[PDB]
C-alpha cells in the first residue's frame, strides 16, 4: 500500500472546499493595536525559552537557561517563587490548572514536576519523570495526576504522576516533536514535529487520531484554539499555519514578506481572534486569527522571542525572549 | 495595603539571592563537543547532556557532549549559540567515513545559529594515519581522487616523512576549503593535529582568538 495514501488525502482535500480569510475579510478587523508594556518583568539573566500562565490569570512561571523557574505576579511584578533547577537546558514549562503544580523539562530527557502549595515553606520536586531518551520539549497538565510530555526521541507520552511511569506512548513521528497543546475538550491533544506533520493524538484512546501535514519545514510551536476545535502551528520557515481537527487541512497560514525566519511560539486570546506569534526577527507579531493580517507588532525585544501566553480571560499577554526580559502587555 | 507591601520584599529579596546566582552562569566559558563515530571525543581532554568541566589559566570551560537520537543536530543546536567554540573532533582513519565526517563540518559551518560561533577542528590520533600509510595498503587516492594530483607546500611537520605529510596536510586543506569557502569573516576554522596531552591548552589560546576577533568588532577597532 505504497500508493494508498494518495487517494484518501486527495479525497480529504475535496472536503476542504474553501479557505478562511475570504469570508472574514469583510468583517471589522482588529485594525492596529499597540499593546504596550504595562509591566516589564526583569530578573532573568540568560535567555528565556518558555513561560506558562496561571489559572487565576495573575501568576505565571517562566523558564530560562540559567537554571531558574521563576513564578511571577502579573499585577505587582513580584517574584513569588524562584525554583532552582538541576538540568538547565530547559525548553519547556507548565502550570497545573489547579494552581498547585508546575513542571519543567528540557534537553535532559526528563520531566521534573514541582509542588507549589506545601507545608514547610518551599516548592519541592514532586515527581521527576524519566522514561524518555530524547530532548524533552513540551510538557503540559490535564489534572494534578496527568501530564502530557513531548520529547526529542520522536515520542509523545502520557503519565500517571503519582505512580511514576507512563500510561501511554504516542508514536508515529519521523522527526522530533517540538511543541504540544492540551485542549479545553479534555480528551484530546495535538503535537507538531520536525517532519512538518502534526499528529492529533488522543488522551483517552491511546493512538494518534488524525494527521496534519503542510509545512515546508520543521515545526516548533503548537497551541489550541480556545474552543478546542482548531489549533495553530508555528513552524521554522516563517509560515504560521492553522488547522482544524475534523477537517485536517490548512485553515489559514499567516505569512508576510519581511518575515523569513522561524516562528518560535503561538498563543491565542480568549476571543480566538488574536493569534500571537513570536518570531526570530527580534520582535513579536499580533495576527488577527481569522483575517490573517499584521494587525499589531509587539516590538519591545532586542533578541528572538521564544514564548507567549494570553490569560484565562484575555486580559494580559506576557512574552519572554532571549533578551532575558519578559514583558507583559495589556 | 501591608500584605502587598510584604509581597514586595519577595521580589526585592529574590533578586538578592538570584542575581548573585546568575553571576556564576557567565564566569565560565561554554564549549560544544561534537564528534561523530570512533573519533575519540571522550578522550581528548579528560543523562543525555553528558558534560565535563576543565580549567586552564583559571578559566573554567564547560563543554556539552549531547547524546542524541542521530546526527541531525537540527533543533537542539539552537541552545548553544551563546557558546564560544564548537570543538569538533574527527579521527585519522578510513576515508569513506571522512567524506561524511567532512560533510559534517559543512553542515555545522553553513548553519543558521552557528553563523557567528567559530568551529575548532581537532584532528585526533595523528600517529595512526602514518601507520595506515606506512603499510601502504591504504588506497587514499581511491576515495579521495584529487589527492595524487597535488602535493605538499612548504612548512611541513618535523618522523618527518613526506608521503604522510602530503596526506596529513591534504585532509586539513580539504576541510579548510569547506571552511573558508563561505565563512564571511565572522567565524574561521582552527585546525589541529593530536592522543597527546597538548589538548587542553590548545583550546585555551584558541578560544582567546575567537574572543579577540569579537573585541576587534565590538570595541570598534
Amino acid at each position, epitope marked *: 500500500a505504497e500508493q494508498l495514501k494518495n487517494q484518501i488525502r486527495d479525497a480529504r482535500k475535496a472536503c476542504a472546499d474553501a479557505t478562511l480569510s475570504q469570508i472574514t475579510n469583510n468583517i471589522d478587523p482588529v485594525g492596529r493595536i499597540q499593546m504596550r508594556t504595562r509591566r516589564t518583568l526583569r530578573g532573568h539573566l540568560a535567555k528565556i525559552y518558555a513561560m506558562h500562565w496561571g489559572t487565576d490569570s495573575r501568576l505565571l512561571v517562566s523558564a530560562s537557561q540559567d537554571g531558574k523557574l521563576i513564578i511571577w505576579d502579573s499585577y505587582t511584578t513580584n517574584k513569588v517563587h524562584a525554583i532552582p533547577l538541576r538540568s538547565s537546558w530547559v525548553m519547556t514549562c507548565a502550570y497545573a490548572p489547579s494552581g498547585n503544580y508546575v513542571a519543567c523539562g528540557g534537553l535532559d530527557n526528563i520531566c521534573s514536576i514541582y509542588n507549589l502549595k506545601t507545608r514547610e*515553606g518551599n516548592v519541592r520536586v514532586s515527581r521527576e519523570l524519566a522514561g524518555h531518551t530524547g530532548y524533552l520539549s513540551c510538557c503540559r497538565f490535564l489534572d494534578d495526576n496527568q501530564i502530557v510530555t513531548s520529547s526529542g526521541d520522536t515520542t509523545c507520552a502520557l503519565w500517571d504522576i503519582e505512580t511514576g511511569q507512563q500510561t501511554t506512548t504516542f508514536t508515529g513521528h519521523t522527526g522530533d516533536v517540538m511543541s504540544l497543546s492540551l485542549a479545553p475538550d479534555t480528551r484530546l491533544f495535538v503535537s507538531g514535529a520536525c517532519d512538518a506533520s502534526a499528529k492529533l493524538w488522543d488522551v483517552r484512546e491511546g493512538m494518534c487520531r488524525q494527521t496534519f501535514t503542510g509545512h515546508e519545514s520543521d515545526i516548533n510551536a503548537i497551541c489550541f484554539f480556545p474552543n478546542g476545535n482548531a489549533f495553530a502551528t508555528g513552524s521554522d520557515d516563517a509560515t504560521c499555519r492553522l488547522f482544524d481537527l475534523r477537517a485536517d487541512q490548512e485553515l489559514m497560514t499567516y505569512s508576510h514578506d519581511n518575515i523569513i525566519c522561524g516562528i518560535t511560539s503561538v498563543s491565542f486570546s480568549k476571543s480566538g481572534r488574536l493569534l500571537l506569534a513570536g518570531y526570530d526577527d527580534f520582535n513579536c507579531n499580533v495576527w488577527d486569527a481569522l483575517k490573517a493580517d499584521r494587525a499589531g507588532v509587539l516590538a519591545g525585544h532586542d533578541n528572538r522571542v521564544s514564548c507567549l501566553g494570553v490569560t484565562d480571560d484575555g486580559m494580559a499577554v506576557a512574552t519572554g525572549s532571549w533578551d532575558s526580559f519578559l514583558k507583559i502587555w495589556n | 495595603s501591608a500584605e502587598d507591601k510584604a509581597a514586595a520584599e519577595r521580589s526585592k529579596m529574590i533578586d538578592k539571592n538570584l542575581r548573585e546566582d546568575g553571576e556564576k552562569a557567565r564566569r565560565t566559558l561554554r564549549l560544544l563537543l561534537l564528534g561523530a563515530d570512533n573519533s575519540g571525543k571522550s578522550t581528548i581532554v579528560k543523562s543525555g547532556i553528558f558534560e565535563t568541566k576543565f580549567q586552564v589559566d583559571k578559566v573554567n570551560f564547560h563543554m556539552f557532549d549531547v547524546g542524541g537520537e542521530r546526527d541531525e543536530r537540527r533543533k537542539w543546536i539552537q541552545c548553544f549559540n551563546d557558546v564560544t567554540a564548537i570543538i569538533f573532533v574527527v579521527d585519522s582513519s578510513d576515508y569513506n567515513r571522512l567524506q561524511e565526517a567532512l560533510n559534517d563540518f559543512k553542515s555545522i559551518w553553513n548553519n543558521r545559529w552557528l553563523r557567528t560561533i567559530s568551529v575548532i577542528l581537532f584532528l585526533n590520533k595523528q600517529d595512526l594515519l602514518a601507520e595506515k600509510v606506512l603499510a601502504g595498503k591504504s588506497k587514499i587516492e581511491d576515495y579521495f581522487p584529487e589527492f595524487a594530483r597535488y602535493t605538499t607546500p612548504e612548512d611541513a611537520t618535523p618522523g618527518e616523512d613526506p608521503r604522510v605529510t602530503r596526506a596529513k596536510y591534504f585532509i586539513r586543506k580539504e576541510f579548510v576549503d569547506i571552511s573558508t569557502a563561505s565563512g564571511d569573516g565572522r567565524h574561521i576554522c582552527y585546525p589541529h593535529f593530536t592522543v597527546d596531552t597538548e589538548n587542553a591548552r590548545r583550546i585555551f589560546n584558541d578560544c582567546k582568538d575567537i574572543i579577540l576577533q569579537m573585541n576587534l568588532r565590538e570595541y570598534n577597532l
Partner: single-chain antibody
Amino acid sequence: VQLVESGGGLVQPGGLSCSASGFAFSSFGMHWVRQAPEKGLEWVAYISSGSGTIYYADTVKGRFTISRDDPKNTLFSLRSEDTAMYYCVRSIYYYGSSPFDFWGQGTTLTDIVMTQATSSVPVTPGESVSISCRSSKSLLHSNGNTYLYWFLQRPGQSPQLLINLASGVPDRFSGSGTAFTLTISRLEAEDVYYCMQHLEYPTFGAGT
C-alpha cells in the same frame, strides 16, 4: 509544619523567643500575638522576609524585641496589657497565598476598630452558628479582595484559622465591605472564635 515557641517566666511587668523546628522560616513572616488570661487576642510585632521590616505594638514600642535567625530558622519592659500569653504566627504573602495559618504552642508568661457581635454565646450544635462582623472602614481595596482574617482557637490549646478557608483546619467552618457574615453549620466537638483584619500595623477589636 510543626511550630513551637518558648514559654517564659513570671517577671513583673517592666523588669522572648520562638525556636520553631523543621521547616523553612527563611521564607516566612514571624509574628507575636498576645492573649490575655481574662481578655483575648491582640497584635504585638512583626518581622518580614529580609532582615528588617520591623513593626511594634503601640504599648511596646521600645519594649522587648523581635528577630529572625534565618540560618537556623529560629527566632530570638512589659505592662498589664503585655502580661498576656504570647503565641506566634507563621505567614507569608503572595498573589494566591493563604497567610497567617500555622500557630505555635504559645501560652507565655504573665487601631482600626472592628465589631464583636455578641461576644458571649455558649455551644449550640446542630444548627447554623453564623457569626457576623463589621469594621470601621471599607476593607475592600481597588483590587477586589476583602482582607478579613477570621481566626479560631481551642479550650486549653493554640489558635488556628478559618476565614476564606485556610488549611490544616476542618471543612465545616465557613460578605461585603464594612460588614460581613459567615455561614458555619453542623458544629462538632473540640471547639473561642475570633475575627481580625491586618490592613495596617493596627488588633481584632474584641477578646472572645
